[PDB]
């Protein structure tokens, strides 16, 4: 039995017209939620020098995506919505894990998940560079100018539990092991 997980689902199937929400029981926090996107958000990576590695997402394309993910989460919990960073778990769930070329990449999505969308015309609080690293276990890093290109087809989320958690509703990436 090996290990499989990630924050963002890449290169899979896309929703036909509107965004989808897959799960075994949506009211079960222990159960993993599956987000399916209508339009694919592009993801570009680059390793130009030692030890600079980064992952670039479009800000206007991501805020459009997230704000529209909140209008669908509203359809189950008609309340204000928060997208936030996870509090625990292994590296593959705390970072966006992927192997690009021959090098495995771990990057932080602290920038993607830290928004609050109101009940009314969905709002933020008021590009996106994801700091990335590669495992320096086996063996010494490879020089530039390596590039990665992929598509965000979905997201793997977990809703925060409790009654004590009033006000808005909070979701964090991870899961959850198996995919759709």
């Amino acid at each position, epitope marked *: 039995k090996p*290990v499989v*997980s990630t924050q963002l689902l890449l290169n899979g199937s896309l929703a036909e017209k509107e965004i989808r929400i897959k*799960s*075994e*029981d949506i*009211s*079960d*926090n*222990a*159960k993993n939620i599956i987000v399916q996107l209508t339009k694919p958000v592009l993801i570009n990576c680059a390793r130009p020098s030692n030890n600079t590695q980064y992952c670039v997402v479009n800000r206007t394309q991501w805020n459009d995506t997230l704000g529209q993910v909140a209008i669908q989460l509203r359809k189950h919990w008609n309340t204000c919505i928060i997208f936030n960073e*996870p*509090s*625990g*778990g*292994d590296l*593959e*769930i705390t970072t966006h894990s992927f192997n690009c070329g021959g090098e495995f990449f771990y990057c932080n999505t602290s920038d993607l998940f830290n928004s609050t969308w109101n009940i009314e015309g969905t709002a933020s609080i008021d590009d996106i560079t994801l700091p990335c690293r590669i495992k320096g276990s086996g063996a010494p890093p490879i020089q530039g100018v390596i590039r990665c290109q992929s598509n965000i087809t979905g997201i793997l989320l*977990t809703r*925060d*539990g*409790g*009654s*004590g*958690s009033g006000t808005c509703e909070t979701f964090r990436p*991870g*899961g*959850g*092991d198996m995919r759709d």
Partner: antibody
């Protein structure tokens, strides 16, 4: 007489921390999806604190007040689980229980077939 | 906590008599039932509203009537005299204690 094994009861000082542990056998551990932590103060009921997944390590807490102080970890090779409580207060004087949930399908609900006999934490100065 | 209220808090019964413990959940999700004695770990009896765990006998049963989720203990035995809590997922009931009526 019998699984799963919980840490010895203790007297802790207000403001301190406590590493409450839980451990079982490989065959009992390989059949567990989650490890939940639930508490009971004397004269109060069973209250869910949080959960930890035996595979991914992922967590979930009952309130914002458990999120910043409670840390739920597990050792996949030694077949254990742990609960760290930061900023100990008299409100935290309770019997901390642990419970396992078998690999289940959504809808059925939560069902804890095995329970640790408990660990009494007394926040006393 | 709005949902998950339970009642009565105390059931005065004699052995042989039948207990009827009710849990009121503000939603249609499945109920679980635990037996709890003083200074003893909770013992799972019922899960999935109607389904009893291996090693639990025909005396204990589980049922639902909308938001009313009830546990029945027919032909009550001395050991069965304890405290009972229900959890609907992450939530637990206020509790109910079964005492010897005299």
């Amino acid at each position: 007489q019998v699984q799963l094994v919980q840490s010895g009861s203790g007297v802790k000082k207000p403001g301190a921390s406590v590493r409450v542990s839980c451990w079982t056998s490989e065959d009992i551990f390989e059949r567990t999806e989650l490890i939940h932590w639930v508490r009971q103060a004397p004269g109060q009921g069973l209250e869910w604190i949080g959960w930890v997944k035996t595979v991914t390590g992922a967590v979930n807490f009952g309130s914002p007040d458990f999120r910043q102080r409670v840390s739920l970890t597990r050792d996949r090779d030694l077949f254990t689980a742990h609960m760290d409580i930061r900023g100990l207060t008299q409100g935290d004087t309770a019997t901390y229980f642990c419970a396992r949930q078998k690999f289940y399908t959504g809808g059925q609900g939560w069902y804890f077939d095995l329970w640790g006999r408990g660990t009494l934490i007394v926040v006393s100065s | 906590e709005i949902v998950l209220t339970q009642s009565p808090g105390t059931l005065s019964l004699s052995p042989g008599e039948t207990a009827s413990l009710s849990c009121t959940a503000a939603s249609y999700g499945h109920m679980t039932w635990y037996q709890k004695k003083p200074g003893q770990p909770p013992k799972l009896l019922i899960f999935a509203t109607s389904k009893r765990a291996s090693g639990i006998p025909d005396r204990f049963s589980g049922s639902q009537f909308g938001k009313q989720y009830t546990l029945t203990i027919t032909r009550m035995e001395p050991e069965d005299f304890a405290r009972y809590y229900c959890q609907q997922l992450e939530f637990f009931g206020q509790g109910t204690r079964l005492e010897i009526r005299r």
